[PDB]
């Protein structure tokens, strides 16, 4: 916030606006950054890298959407935090890495519409898995056995659950089809794994997540 | 001695000839349009409109009324693949650039969005704008039967059907709007290369609310197989009106007798693809056609040109149909209308056929392979000629089980819902067609390409016979496109800081060929406004530079700096294909 | 020899509605051009308001019709003319107005496409720019001061400011449209001194918002003409409806004596309130405005390559509603001239046509208001008001004038005479729509002009003597319904012909060859093009089937022939209309 | 999102001289250019929009009171 509090100045400035100048000076420079000199070009390249800069305050869809928990009510899984080229605070990428809000992707079911993340939250956590996953439902009877917390097993594309019309949650959820992404209530990701093998490493997971003795 | 003398004579009032009508109306030349047919179509047809049409559609003065009666684009957001209508779906894709994937490039890529409006609603619509233009005539139940031609002109024979009399029409050119099997091109001596009857359709027009089955997945297209059929007989269910108003299409085996009057039997047909029986169907019109695939060689003859279906048939698939009559047109009628006035030599005419055949041939090859693709979703689900209702059900259930079998056919499924994007989103081959000989000039420069699909993905350039880029400009307060202040009869030159060279030499182009050409800065002299930067960056010239662009809204030429301002005359010579 | 900062075929100075109309010409012809405006923002206060059908016509042909029709007052919501005491109060007369009585509506349906409605200049005024922003043709800059010109055998230069940067640059046009408004820069530059009179009276215009449905629904008008009791006959208030019936103008005349003063809005408030009749009414002011009426006409709209329109050259006070009319027409006869001038397809004698045309137009419209501006007085002096009567002696006046007696009877006469006389102002048909260009861009056909017994300035009678608008007749081509006047116009000569008239086409071909103009033949009633349903338009042609009318792109009529016989004449018609 | 201002008629952010002068720089906004649109798309079944504090309030006072659960106590 600070720094694009910083960045507003920037746009007069690159204008050549400064103090003890008339109206009529200041019309004068707007009316001349069309011009073929020296002078005109130094602040008509000023003006477009300090508008490119407002960005961090238009268009702050990283910042906004896409801070990830690093330590807190979670187990990471081993993988290292997924980054990129891009300016992160510009821009957003999906991961079920554990902290991160859990990617949206449409699903369906019957013929009602709903997100990834209206069939997650609402006060409970909720295991999002596939084809394969039939395993950690016996994971999440032992884990509320072991902890008192109920645990949701929701299949999508499988045994009759919600559908992924688009293929777009098979594409993000990072994990195989046997695999599971455990979701808080706050609709971040408390934990993740591959494949249906990491079934009984639940109890255990939930355990840690709840800090229970 | 001839009947009637007119400069132009339109064959066939469909959307080729009264978009040929229309663009004659706006530059003001007389012109006798005659159709076979007493009335427009009584029935949809072609119905989706792509980018370019709308470009096309605001250049000719149409786009609001267009707007006013269409189906606007997220209402065709998905191209859907399912058993029946209300059973199991089994594939979705998003379509016509409503896809987050997509979106941004269909709304950089033009001012117009896509829309959907049935031939039998466009086609008054047309006849509406020609008649209040009142430069032309429209003449319904007249049906062309012959023509010769000279150096000088065409004499066409005409049937009054009403009456019975013959009369005759001499005309400087002579349009060939006659849609498939035209007689205009059979009079010429061409013959389409391609094949006739691939396939047979049946296309039910059809009321009924199935909302219940589509509002929670709004489709143009939704492509259903019912359970114990062969994969050849899928169901296509076209959205008309969301969500009460269909068609229909089946595709009956050679071996099959279709009558179209037999309504109960449409109707329980339609009923088995719904997997309904409880909905109420209305039949508002059975027809039965032939698919075919093929292109014509050559688009004209001396002082006649073809148009549209005369020129162009394919199956429905992309709809390009519709949309390349249109350009078809748009791309002739500014040509005539120089010659006409001497401006132009017969050479610039000779453009037309050079610079659209080679645009059928894509859309007819297009529209063919899109065809193909769609075998290939049952195909992948594992269905086959002699199969039971229950084992179809069965390899729909198991799909998604946890064996090797299904693994295997949800990636072949994978696989062939991806290829239906050369259908739903071949951004490519609708706006991204590029002339690269006819009336323009080449600047030297390679034409731009990168690794993606041309299919699928758009490129904007400035490259020479390219449709000019899409840019938001602002003229005080009013927001305009790049392409809202070039096209409308005349030739502009874009320009910009430093460019006031292309001043004089626009100037000298006009004493040197008779063409005006209008001059027009962008972010200097007073000119639009150029807000975001985006001209900037797509003309693909220095600011000193010009594109010149073409009444039809394509790129003539091109030039980087000022320094080219002296070669304009002879550019505009060689376009306007001059002694 | 210096350096101009701009070249550009036409400078129009002034963005009023005759400047902003011209623009739109010009834009629609596909003209460049420039328009330079003193004030940094169109007009900000309503002023003008009545849109006659002649308007209403050439915003069809100019293509804002519908645009303008949206936001406009429909014409049977003016339908009458009202004389009152306070707008409480009672009723002294009344009379129908713009074509809404009984005996002339006939005479307005048939007349035009168009109707009569209202749209103040702050609403219309953006209209105008809107469309000349959409069509991208020529430069509106809002905040540059015309300062002077010079001119030669080869064009104008023009020194213009920037308002805003203080910078002075100057324009080398080919031609130059002074549109600048009353006490015109531009006309001052030529030489050219205004006939007549500035200041003859002063008023104060409150443009103000206020519910007063309850006493004018029931007798819907344009123009309410109140009389306080206890007033001279001079001291008349006007409302004029704007908004039915929740925003107004309210017009005094202060007398040359008074102290006036714009700021004071609760004396202004007072006055209103007066004038209603009634103290318990709300009165929101938006703006009062102090102005002086004029009524003057220059005895030249041109000179050289130099052309005046709009107030520039005729000032007068706003009774018929003709300034903005006029100027919109000024405008419109001008525009498809220069066009022609500047593809050498026209001599400067088409450009001397302006004048000729549009000048005895001038006088007309001036003279016109004028008279209307002095009938207005001869209701309050028939009902026996004066100076120096109380408020108990005018309600008496107007108690008594409805009784058995010979004072009343006699009251009653002149107060019908005085109401008749109203009609010049209320349904001028004639001055609104039946002016004819005797001398100009036409070629009479040797036919004396049309008259009859009836008042010209009444009533409109329909002609198509070159000169005269082309009368009005439905149409309809294929199924399209539209009027002479649609099929017509549009920046380009068009030829209406019927029956036997094939012959025009030869003729028509061989006057664009010799001429370089194109004229366009539409055939009526045959060879297939648009029919005329009621056969009006075979009433109204005063030519044979197989003969021909030549329209302007203004609409009027260049030239006409009785038959087919004429159809060699009109190469020659057309080369001599054009001035070459 | 009943009382809200929804995302496309936030689509840039306008640098200018005065309200009625003219302009100085301008980008999209909150998503809207093409460029991003995209992504903000697909990355939430939400989209932005605008909604000022003293209609916000209300509006989750409402539908605590109707929950009754707690209890809120003002002043
Ligand atoms: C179910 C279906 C769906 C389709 N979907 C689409 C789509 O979504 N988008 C799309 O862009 N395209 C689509 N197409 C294709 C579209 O229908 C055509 O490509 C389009 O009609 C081309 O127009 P045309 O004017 O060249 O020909 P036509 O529509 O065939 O019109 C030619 C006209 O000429 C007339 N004529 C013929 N002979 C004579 C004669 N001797 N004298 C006078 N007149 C004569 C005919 O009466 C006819 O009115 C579809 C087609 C079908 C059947
Ligand atoms: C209260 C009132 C009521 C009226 N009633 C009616 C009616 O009902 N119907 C009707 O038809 N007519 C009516 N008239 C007449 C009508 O208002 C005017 O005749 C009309 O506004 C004239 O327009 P114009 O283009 O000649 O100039 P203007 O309206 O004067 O516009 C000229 C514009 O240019 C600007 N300008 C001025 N000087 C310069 C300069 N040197 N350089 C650049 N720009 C400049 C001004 O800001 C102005 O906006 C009425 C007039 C008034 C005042
Ligand atoms: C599943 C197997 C089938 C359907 C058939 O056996 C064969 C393979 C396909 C054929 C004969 C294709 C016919 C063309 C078709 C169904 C196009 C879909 C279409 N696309 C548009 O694009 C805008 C507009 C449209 O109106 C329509 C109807
Ligand atoms: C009763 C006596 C009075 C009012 C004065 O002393 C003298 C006689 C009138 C003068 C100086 C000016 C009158 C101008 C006027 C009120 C015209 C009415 C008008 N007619 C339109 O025609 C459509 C449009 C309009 O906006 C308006 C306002
Ligand atoms: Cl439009
Ligand atoms: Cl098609
Ligand atoms: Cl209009
Ligand atoms: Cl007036």
Same mark, same amino acid.
């Given at each position: 916030?600070?720094?694009?509090?910083?960045?507003?100045?920037?746009?007069?400035?690159?204008?050549?606006?400064?103090?003890?100048?008339?109206?009529?000076?200041?019309? /004068?420079?707007?009316? !001349? %950054?069309?011009?073929?000199?020296?002078?005109?070009?130094? @602040?008509? =390249? *000023?003006?477009? #890298? $300090?508008?490119?800069?407002?960005?961090?305050?238009?268009?702050?869809?990283?910042?906004?959407?896409?801070?990830?928990?690093?330590?807190?009510?979670?187990?990471?899984?081993?993988?290292?935090?997924?980054?990129?080229?891009?300016?992160?605070?510009?821009?957003?990428?999906?991961?079920?890495?554990?902290?991160?809000?859990?990617?949206?992707?449409?699903?369906?079911?019957?013929?009602?519409?709903?997100?990834?993340?209206?069939?997650?939250? /609402?006060?409970?956590? !909720? %295991?999002?898995?596939?084809?394969?996953?039939?395993?950690? @439902?016996? =994971? *999440?009877?032992? #884990? $509320?056995?072991?902890?008192?917390?109920?645990?949701?097993?929701?299949?999508?594309?499988?045994?009759?659950?919600?559908?992924?019309?688009?293929?777009?949650?098979?594409?993000?959820?990072?994990?195989?089809?046997?695999?599971?992404?455990?979701?808080?209530?706050?609709?971040?990701?408390?934990?993740?794994?591959?494949?249906?093998?990491?079934?009984?490493?639940?109890?255990?997971?939930?355990?840690?997540?709840?800090?229970?003795? | 001695?001839?009947?009637?003398?007119?400069?132009?004579?339109?064959?066939?009032?469909?959307?080729?000839?009264?978009?040929?009508?229309?663009?004659?109306?706006?530059?003001?030349?007389?012109?006798?349009?005659?159709?076979?047919?007493?009335?427009?179509?009584?029935?949809?047809?072609?119905?989706?409109?792509?980018?370019?049409?709308?470009?096309?559609?605001?250049?000719?003065?149409?786009?609001?009324?267009?707007?006013?009666?269409?189906?606007?684009?997220?209402?065709?957001?998905?191209?859907?693949?399912?058993?029946?209508?209300?059973?199991?779906?089994?594939?979705?894709?998003?379509?016509?650039?409503?896809?987050?994937?997509?979106?941004?490039?269909?709304?950089?890529?033009?001012?117009?969005?896509?829309?959907?409006?049935?031939?039998?609603?466009?086609?008054?619509?047309?006849?509406?704008?020609?008649?209040?233009?009142?430069?032309?005539?429209?003449?319904?139940?007249?049906?062309?039967?012959?023509?010769?031609?000279?150096?000088?002109?065409?004499?066409?024979?005409?049937?009054?059907?009403?009456?019975?009399?013959?009369?005759?029409?001499?005309?400087?050119?002579?349009?060939?709007?006659?849609?498939?099997?035209?007689?205009?091109?059979?009079?010429?001596?061409?013959?389409?290369?391609?094949?006739?009857?691939?396939?047979?359709?049946?296309?039910?027009?059809?009321?009924?609310?199935?909302?219940?089955?589509?509002?929670?997945?709004?489709?143009?297209?939704?492509?259903?197989?019912?359970?114990?059929?062969?994969?050849?007989?899928?169901?296509?269910?076209?959205?008309?009106?969301?969500?009460?108003?269909?068609?229909?299409?089946?595709?009956?085996?050679?071996?099959?007798?279709?009558?179209?009057?037999?309504?109960?039997?449409?109707?329980?047909?339609?009923?088995?693809?719904?997997?309904?029986?409880?909905?109420?169907?209305?039949?508002?019109?059975?027809?039965?056609?032939?698919?075919?695939?093929?292109?014509?060689?050559?688009?004209?003859?001396?002082?006649?040109?073809?148009?549209?279906?005369?020129?162009?048939?394919?199956?429905?698939?992309?709809?390009?149909?519709?949309?390349?009559?249109?350009?078809?047109?748009?791309?002739?009628?500014?040509?005539?209308?120089?010659?006409?006035?001497?401006?132009?030599?017969?050479?610039?005419?000779?453009?037309?056929?050079?610079?659209?055949?080679?645009?059928?041939?894509?859309?007819?090859?297009?529209?063919?392979?899109?065809?193909?693709?769609?075998?290939?979703?049952?195909?992948?689900?594992?269905?086959?000629?002699?199969?039971?209702?229950?084992?179809?059900?069965?390899?729909?259930?198991?799909?998604?089980?946890?064996?090797?079998?299904?693994?295997?056919?949800?990636?072949?499924?994978?696989?062939?819902?991806?290829?239906?994007?050369?259908?739903?989103?071949?951004?490519?081959?609708?706006?991204?067609?590029?002339?690269?000989?006819?009336?323009?000039?080449?600047?030297?420069?390679?034409?731009?390409?990168?690794?993606?699909?041309?299919?699928?993905?758009?490129?904007?350039?400035?490259?020479?016979?390219?449709?000019?880029?899409?840019?938001?400009?602002?003229?005080?307060?009013?927001?305009?496109?790049?392409?809202?202040?070039?096209?409308?009869?005349?030739?502009?030159?874009?320009?910009?800081?430093?460019?006031?060279?292309?001043?004089?030499?626009?100037?000298?182009?006009?004493?040197?060929?008779?063409?005006?050409?209008?001059?027009?800065?962008?972010?200097?002299?007073?000119?639009?406004?150029?807000?975001?930067?985006?001209?900037?960056?797509?003309?693909?010239?220095?600011?000193?530079?010009?594109?010149?662009?073409?009444?039809?809204?394509?790129?003539?030429?091109?030039?980087?700096?000022?320094?080219?301002?002296?070669?304009?005359?002879?550019?505009?010579?060689?376009?306007?294909?001059?002694?």
């Amino acid at each position: 916030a600070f720094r694009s509090m910083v960045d507003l100045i920037g746009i007069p400035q690159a204008l050549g606006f400064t103090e003890g100048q008339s109206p009529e000076e200041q019309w /004068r420079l707007l009316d !001349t %950054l069309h011009e073929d000199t020296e002078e005109a070009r130094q @602040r008509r =390249a *000023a003006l477009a #890298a $300090a508008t490119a800069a407002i960005h961090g305050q238009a268009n702050a869809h990283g910042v906004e959407l896409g801070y990830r928990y690093r330590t807190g009510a979670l187990v990471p899984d081993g993988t290292p935090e997924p980054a990129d080229e891009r300016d992160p605070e510009l821009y957003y990428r999906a991961t079920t890495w554990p902290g991160a809000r859990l990617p949206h992707a449409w699903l369906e079911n019957g013929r009602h519409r709903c997100s990834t993340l209206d069939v997650t939250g /609402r006060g409970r956590f !909720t %295991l999002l898995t596939g084809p394969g996953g039939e395993p950690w @439902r016996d =994971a *999440a009877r032992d #884990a $509320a056995l072991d902890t008192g917390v109920e645990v949701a097993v929701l299949p999508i594309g499988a045994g009759g659950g919600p559908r992924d019309p688009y293929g777009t949650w098979a594409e993000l959820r990072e994990v195989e089809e046997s695999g599971a992404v455990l979701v808080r209530p706050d609709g971040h990701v408390a934990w993740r794994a591959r494949d249906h093998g990491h079934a009984k490493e639940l109890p255990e997971v939930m355990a840690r997540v709840l800090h229970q003795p | 001695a001839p009947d009637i003398r007119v400069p132009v004579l339109i064959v066939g009032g469909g959307p080729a000839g009264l978009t040929a009508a229309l663009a004659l109306s706006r530059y003001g030349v007389p012109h006798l349009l005659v159709n076979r047919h007493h009335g427009t179509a009584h029935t949809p047809r072609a119905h989706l409109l792509n980018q370019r049409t709308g470009e096309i559609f605001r250049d000719l003065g149409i786009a609001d009324r267009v707007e006013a009666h269409a189906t606007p684009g997220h209402l065709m957001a998905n191209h859907v693949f399912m058993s029946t209508f209300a059973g199991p779906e089994v594939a979705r894709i998003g379509a016509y650039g409503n896809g987050p994937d997509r979106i941004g490039e269909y709304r950089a890529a033009s001012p117009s969005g896509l829309c959907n409006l049935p031939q039998h609603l466009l086609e008054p619509l047309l006849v509406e704008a020609v008649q209040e233009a009142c430069v032309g005539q429209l003449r319904f139940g007249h049906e062309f039967v012959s023509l010769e031609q000279d150096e000088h002109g065409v004499t066409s024979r005409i049937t009054d059907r009403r009456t019975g009399r013959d009369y005759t029409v001499r005309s400087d050119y002579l349009i060939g709007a006659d849609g498939a099997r035209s007689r205009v091109l059979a009079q010429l001596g061409i013959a389409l290369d391609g094949a006739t009857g691939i396939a047979r359709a049946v296309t039910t027009w059809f009321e009924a609310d199935l909302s219940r089955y589509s509002a929670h997945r709004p489709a143009l297209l939704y492509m259903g197989a019912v359970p114990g059929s062969p994969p050849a007989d899928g169901r296509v269910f076209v959205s008309l009106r969301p969500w009460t108003e269909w068609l229909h299409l089946t595709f009956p085996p050679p071996t099959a007798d279709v009558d179209v009057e037999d309504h109960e039997a449409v109707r329980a047909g339609i009923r088995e693809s719904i997997g309904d029986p409880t909905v109420d169907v209305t039949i508002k019109n059975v027809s039965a056609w032939e698919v075919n695939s093929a292109v014509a060689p050559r688009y004209a003859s001396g002082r006649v040109f073809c148009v549209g279906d005369a020129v162009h048939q394919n199956p429905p698939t992309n709809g390009l149909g519709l949309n390349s009559a249109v350009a078809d047109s748009f791309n002739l009628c500014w040509k005539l209308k120089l010659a006409l006035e001497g401006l132009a030599g017969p050479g610039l005419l000779d453009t037309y056929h050079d610079e659209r055949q080679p645009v059928g041939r894509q859309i007819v090859d297009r529209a063919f392979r899109s065809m193909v693709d769609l075998i290939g979703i049952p195909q992948a689900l594992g269905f086959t000629e002699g199969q039971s209702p229950e084992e179809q059900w069965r390899l729909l259930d198991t799909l998604h089980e946890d064996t090797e079998e299904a693994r295997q056919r949800r990636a072949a499924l994978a696989a062939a819902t991806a290829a239906i994007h050369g259908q739903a989103n071949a951004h490519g081959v609708e706006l991204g067609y590029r002339y690269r000989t006819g009336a323009l000039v080449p600047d030297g420069t390679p034409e731009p390409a990168d690794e993606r699909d041309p299919e699928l993905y758009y490129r904007a350039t400035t490259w020479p016979g390219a449709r000019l880029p899409h840019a938001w400009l602002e003229n005080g307060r009013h927001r305009c496109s790049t392409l809202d202040v070039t096209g409308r009869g005349r030739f502009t030159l874009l320009t910009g800081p430093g460019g006031e060279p292309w001043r004089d030499a626009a100037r000298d182009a006009a004493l040197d060929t008779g063409v005006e050409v209008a001059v027009l800065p962008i972010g200097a002299g007073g000119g639009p406004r150029d807000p975001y930067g985006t001209w900037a960056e797509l003309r693909e010239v220095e600011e000193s530079g010009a594109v010149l662009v073409r009444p039809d809204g394509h790129v003539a030429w091109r030039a980087r700096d000022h320094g080219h301002a002296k070669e304009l005359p002879e550019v505009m010579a060689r376009v306007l294909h001059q002694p």
